[PDB]
Amino acid sequence: TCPFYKKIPGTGFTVDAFQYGVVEGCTAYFLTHFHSDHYAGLSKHFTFPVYCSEITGNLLKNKLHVQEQYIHPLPLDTECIVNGVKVVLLDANHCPGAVMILFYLPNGTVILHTGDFRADPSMERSLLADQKVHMLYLDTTYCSPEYTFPSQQEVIRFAINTAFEAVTLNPHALVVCGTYSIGKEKVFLAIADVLGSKVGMSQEKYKTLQCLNIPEINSLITTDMCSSLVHLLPMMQINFKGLQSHLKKCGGKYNQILAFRPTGWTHSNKFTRIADVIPQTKGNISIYGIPYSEHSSYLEMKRFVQWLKPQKIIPTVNVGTWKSRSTMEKYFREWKLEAGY
Ligand code: NI
């Protein structure tokens, strides 16, 4: 049955609640972004109204075959009326098409649901700055102080410099990047741009990327692997066996692989700077795990909450154990006492 933290009080709404069947009393289903733990349950047989961003709506129509008459895309940063309730969609700084949702309840309560997000000071100047928020439904994925990671900009600098150096020393090296969902496109797009190549990938992945409104995409991606020296593979194939096999398929065009796995966090972060990251190597294959995150660090999350000053926080991640829940509630209290709200 649907957990309470997916239900919006005083409305007929649910958020990312598609795996529970017909939710009793739900008149509109919101979807924050196209990731499977959030869309699980949607298909061409869905006949309730789904509200989402334009990009998410393109993916629902093209990848899951949801019929168009049930997709309700909304522009960003624009006040809209849904079933008599004012709502706004805000950029979540997560993956393409990902949004936060502001609900203005008929009784005066204002609720922000962050979906999945990476908090940023640029959010302090959106339509959030314009009224008080009473309740915050918060993406708490990395809500513990051990979760530090560098900026996305530093991580991409590392990846570009590493790839450019490797291929300049050996023009017969292939670069491979792993993927399993949308998000983190900058990784493979920035490397292809510094090497003067398109990114080669499967027809199914090319289709997914063509749904995203990324400017000049026909210019950066392709299905012709033969013409490309940056290849995208499923995340599961980024290991020594899967990469040795791939190199066999390239028919002696290449004699070395440099591969990237853009993970969220890994405990190398507590001890090591980005500057100091080294690969795992076997023979002519090297694999780099780089800490490219599309969720808030602990400090980014703290700064956002201390700025917003909500009256009540509802975590949406790590809610399944008492130890996790008690840990998070203790941080929330600290933040409130330190800031004075
Ligand atoms: Ni997500």
Swiss-Prot record:
Changing D139N: Impaired nuclear focus formation, reduced interaction with PIAS and increased sensitivity to cisplatin. This is DNA cross-link repair 1A protein. Belongs to the DNA repair metallo-beta-lactamase (DRMBL) family. May be required for DNA interstrand cross-link repair. Also required for checkpoint mediated cell cycle arrest in early prophase in response to mitotic spindle poisons. Possesses beta-lactamase activity, catalyzing the hydrolysis of penicillin G and nitrocefin. Exhibits no activity towards other beta-lactam antibiotic classes including cephalosporins (cefotaxime) and carbapenems (imipenem). It comes from Homo sapiens (Human). It is found in: Nucleus. Binds constitutively to TP53BP1. Binds CDC27, which is itself a component of the anaphase promoting complex (APC). Binds PIAS1. Expressed in brain, heart, kidney, liver, pancreas, placenta and skeletal muscle. The lineage of its organism: Eukaryota, Metazoa, Chordata, Craniata, Vertebrata. Induction: During mitosis. The mRNA encoding this protein contains an internal ribosome entry site (IRES) in its 5'-UTR. This 5'-UTR generally suppresses translation while specifically promoting expression during mitosis, when cap-dependent translation may be impaired. The chain holds residues 700 to 1040 of 1040 of the full protein.
